[PDB]
Every structure is written in C-alpha cells, then in structure tokens.
Write a protein that binds this ligand. Structure first.
Ligand SMILES: [Mn+2]
Ligand SMILES: [Mn+2]
Lengths: 4, 405
C-alpha cells in the first residue's frame, strides 16, 4: 500500500 | 519461445529501438547492474531493456550515425553462468566480453562519441565508472526511461492480470476458515501464492487484528485474535518481475454486527464511485481523483453524525493518499507528473480508508477500528479493466463464504  | 515469463525476445528488441529514436548522432548510454548482498534483485532499468538477471554486469547501447540500422548492443558478463557465447545466442547481444576487461574496453567507446548518458547521482561497477568522469557533454537518462515504462504493452497487461488472479483466489480460500493467531494466517497466504504459480512475495505484508489496525506500518504479525474484532490484511504475490497489490477486511466471528456494517459501507461507497471515473475520455488526472475522494468521504461522515468533533477534521481520520502507479516496482515511476491527465495503458490503485481513535468524544462502538479496501485498475479508451475482480467484497457475498464455504 499508501504512498503518503 | 519466450525469454522471461510473458515477454518474447522480439519485444525486448523493439524497446531498444524506441529509445534510440530519441537520441542525436554519436551517443552512448551506460547502465550498471547490482551485486549480491539474500535472493538477488536486479536493477530494474537494465532489466526492462534486456531481461538479464545475473550480478556484476554492464550494458552499453551505442548509436554511431543518424540511421537506425547501425545501432550496437554491448554486454560484459562474468566468464550456473550463461557465458560470452550464450549472451549473444540467447539474449541477442551484438558484442560481448568478460567483465574483468572493463578498464580497457569502455574507454575505447567513450573517446569516439559526443554525448554521454550516465546518472552521476551502491554497486561496485557504479563507483568504478563514476570515478572515470570526475569538449563533451554528460546527461541524465533515468527520468527519460520512466516515460516509456509508464505505458504498458498488451503483453505486459496480460501477465499482470495473471498475478492478480492468483492472489485473489487465495483470499477467497482464507475467508472460509478460522484463525486464532496472526502468524498462522500469515503463513497460509504465503504458501497459496507460491503453489498457485507466483515466484515470491511482492512486499512485506500486514496482518493486524483489533486495535493493531490503527498503525499504518504494523509488521510484527504475532498477536492473539479475539472473537469481537475485525482484521486488516495487505499482501500479494509477484510473477516474472511484475507486482500485484490487495487489501481486504472482514470480521473474525463470521457475521457483521450493526455497528460494523455502518462503517464498512462508508468505505465501500467511496471506492466504487472513484473506480467509475477511470476512463481516459474524462481527462482526469491522479490528483483530480484524490481531491474528489476527500469531498465524498466528508458526506459519508455527516450521514454517520460524526463530522463535527472538535480537533478531528477529515484529514485526521483519513490521513493518506488515494493511490499510485504500479508495475515492475510497487511504487512505480515516482518521478512522472501527478498533475497531467491519465493516458491509455497506465495501471493505478484505489485504496481509501478510515481509522477511529480511542477518545470519549466518539460512540463506544466505533473506537479502535480500522478499515481499508484496495484493487488494481487499468485505464482504457472508453472503459477500464479490473485486474483483481475475483476477490469478493460485498457484504452479502462475504457472509455467504464465511458460513457455507
Ligand atoms: Mn497495499
Ligand atoms: Mn498500494
């Protein structure tokens, strides 16, 4: 998963 | 008749021709590979152009004139090994030699060219070549290669679909069982990926039950699983170099309660609406989609009556981005622009979520709960393609597999  | 799983030797040749079509006369590109530290992991820019997966090697691509039929492809390799005769007969290199001859072979190429492409800003051959370059011009190359990697070919799309199908059926088989510790669920999914046909894990996974689900980077995966909680899992496999990526959440007891139903439906509502936008005729960009996902979530929070809490705006209950590009790396091509419209052939993820803290300002049946749902989507001309569609997510489909199998 999530980048930022 | 393939070279690597899913890709033929002819496509690799066409990738090299397309890059040469953007270079001026008298240029040469230089790329160095990685070393053994551990299962080996090649430098992905060199793998995209050749398919070679041995350590301690150097690749060079040379363009002498303004004609596309004079191009030359060099490779330097160690003397199981493929060898000098195999790298030409199987990988189709025009010239080859032993890696021990780098101090005499490379200088002959540099002296006869005008433009030198090398990323001056850790491998053993990298430190060697950089020390040589500190009336010619030195230019970067990594950003220019990424603009090609972000548009997948029809064959590339087909191998990514197979890895997403294998990971999704493994989730369905886990839904029909009961587990009492995070570590048993972890080792089950890993074995199903491999015996299903994948090569290895795509990334280090998350298995977090109960209150552990509030930590976005939880990795220990060794706790006891209580009968009153839900669990959040993020894991997937990889095949031939290409990655997948999946998230699901479900209750440990096998039946949704009323409070569990109301929170899960808020997350699923946002995800379905955002997936419908992924059409290239709409002209949306990735950042446009993130902005619209914030507007949709705050309406769901208003219907729940939990949107006016002092000190907990929407950015604190939903504190991460909406997705990213996907390919040979998990966070693929991170240097392209987030603000330009999406094109036909890209692959992106969609993964919103919600996470409620342990404070008295919220109802007692909402504290210490976290949920996330994620899929992989390919962009089309006037439609799209869901690559991980086999894994169920609707409430009525979930409860049917958990109870009947
Ligand atoms: Mn993920
Ligand atoms: Mn992801």
């Amino acid at each position: 998963x999530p980048p930022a | 008749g393939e070279l690597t799983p899913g890709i033929s030797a002819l496509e690799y040749y066409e990738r090299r021709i397309r890059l040469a079509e953007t270079l001026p006369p008298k240029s040469c590109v230089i790329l160095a590979g990685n070393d053994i530290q551990y299962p080996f992991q090649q430098e992905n820019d060199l793998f995209y152009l050749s398919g070679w997966n041995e350590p301690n090697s150097v690749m060079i691509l040379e363009k002498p004139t303004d004609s596309l039929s004079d191009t030359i492809f060099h490779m330097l390799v160690p003397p199981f090994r493929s060898g000098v005769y195999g790298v030409q007969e199987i990988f189709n290199a025009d010239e080859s030699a032993s890696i021990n001859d780098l101090s005499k072979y490379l200088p002959k190429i540099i002296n006869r060219n005008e433009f030198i492409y090398f990323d001056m800003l850790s491998s053993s051959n990298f430190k060697h070549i950089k020390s040589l370059l500190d009336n010619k011009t030195i230019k970067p190359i990594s950003k220019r290669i990424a603009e090609f990697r972000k548009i997948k070919s029809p064959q590339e799309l087909r191998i990514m679909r197979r890895a997403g199908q294998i990971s999704g059926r493994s989730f369905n088989q886990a839904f029909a069982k009961r587990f009492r510790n995070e570590r048993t669920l972890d080792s089950f999914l890993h074995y199903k990926f491999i015996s299903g046909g994948c090569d290895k894990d795509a990334y280090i996974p998350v298995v977090a039950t109960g209150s552990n689900s509030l930590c976005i980077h939880y990795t220990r995966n060794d706790d006891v699983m209580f009968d009153d909680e839900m669990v959040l899992v993020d894991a997937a496999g990889s095949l031939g170099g290409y990655c997948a990526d999946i998230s699901r959440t479900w209750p440990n007891s096998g039946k949704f309660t009323d409070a569990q139903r109301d929170l899960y439906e808020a997350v699923l509502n946002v995800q379905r609406d955002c997936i419908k936008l992924c059409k290239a005729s709409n002209n949306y960009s990735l950042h446009d989609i993130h902005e619209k996902s914030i507007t949709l979530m705050k309406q769901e929070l208003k219907n729940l009556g939990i949107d006016k809490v002092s000190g907990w705006n929407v950015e604190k209950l939903y504190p991460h981005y909406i997705g990213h590009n996907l390919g040979l790396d998990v966070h693929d091509v991170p240097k392209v622009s987030r603000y330009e419209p999406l094109k036909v052939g890209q692959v992106i993820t969609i993964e919103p979520g919600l996470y409620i803290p342990n404070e008295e300002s919220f109802p007692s049946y909402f504290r210490n709960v976290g949920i996330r749902i994620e899929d992989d989507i390919a962009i089309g001309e006037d439609t799209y393609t869901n690559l991980t569609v086999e894994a169920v997510k609707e409430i009525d489909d979930l409860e049917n597999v958990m109870q009947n199998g």
